[PDB]
A paper describes a structure:
Fentanyl is a potent agonist of the μ-opioid receptor (MOR), with an affinity of approximately 1 nM and a potency 100-times that of morphine. Custom-designed ligand-binding proteins offer the possibility of both detecting and counteracting toxins such as fentanyl. Fen49 was designed to bind a solvated fentanyl.
From the SSM experiments, we identified a Fen49 Y88A point mutant, termed Fen49*, that proved to be more suitable for complex structure determination. The 1.79 Å Fen49*-apo structure again revealed a highly preorganized binding site, and an overall structure in close agreement with the Fen49 design (0.72 r.m.s.d. for Fen49* compared with the design model over 184 of 185 residues (TM_align score of 0.98)). The only significant deviation from the parent Fen49 is in the loop region Thr87 – Thr93, which contains the Y88A substitution. Unlike the parent Fen49, Fen49*-apo produced crystals with an empty binding cavity that proved to be useful for soaking experiments.
Author numbering: 1 to 185
């Protein structure tokens, strides 16, 4: 279905001027921030959804990421499919690769401790990552066939929970500046 969810989260640092645009469109102007995640998407994620997006502007300056971001409960797990970024070194436990939507992604797993989640301000949870091996071109219609990622993660025993929460094509960052404009459908 078309989008029905607006995510606008910041830890409070600097400027995160997030604009809830028409329909699935949004934009973000950010500068000297802390952590933040912003985007349009769906209230209930699905492992079978094909996410469409067009990033008309993608201009991160620092640690910023253009990524599908979502959650399950039962158990509580955060997941990320990163298509582009500014300056970022991907590091940590490495599980393999998945090919999807004309690209190849590296699979990582991490843990966050005493951090914000959909369940509270100080929670501990596993994170599943797909990170594109090269930055995806932007400005044209793009697809994330999320089922390919779910299935690849499953093949490494990285199972998602049964109670699906939000699923957003996000702009996220950490102590950085930039601008983005993304339409999601
Ligand atoms: K709006």
């Amino acid at each position: 279905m078309s989008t029905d969810y607006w995510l606008n989260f910041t830890d409070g640092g600097g400027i995160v001027n997030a604009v809830n645009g028409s329909g699935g469109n949004y934009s973000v102007n950010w500068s000297n921030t802390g952590s933040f995640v912003v985007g349009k998407g769906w209230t209930t994620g699905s492992p079978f959804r094909t996410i469409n997006y067009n990033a008309g502007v993608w201009a991160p300056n620092g640690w910023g990421a253009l990524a599908l971001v979502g959650w399950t409960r039962s158990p509580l797990i955060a997941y990320y499919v990163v298509d582009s970024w500014g300056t970022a070194r991907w590091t940590g436990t490495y599980k393999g690769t998945v090919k999807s939507d004309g690209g190849t992604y590296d699979i990582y797993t991490t843990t966050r401790y005493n951090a914000p989640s959909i369940d509270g301000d100080r929670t501990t949870f596993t994170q599943y990552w797909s990170v594109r091996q090269s930055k995806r071109p932007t400005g044209s219609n793009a697809t994330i066939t999320f089922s390919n990622h779910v299935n690849a993660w499953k093949s490494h025993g990285m199972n998602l929970g049964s109670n699906w929460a939000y699923q957003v094509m996000a702009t996220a960052g950490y102590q950085s500046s930039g601008s983005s404009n993304v339409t999601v459908w």
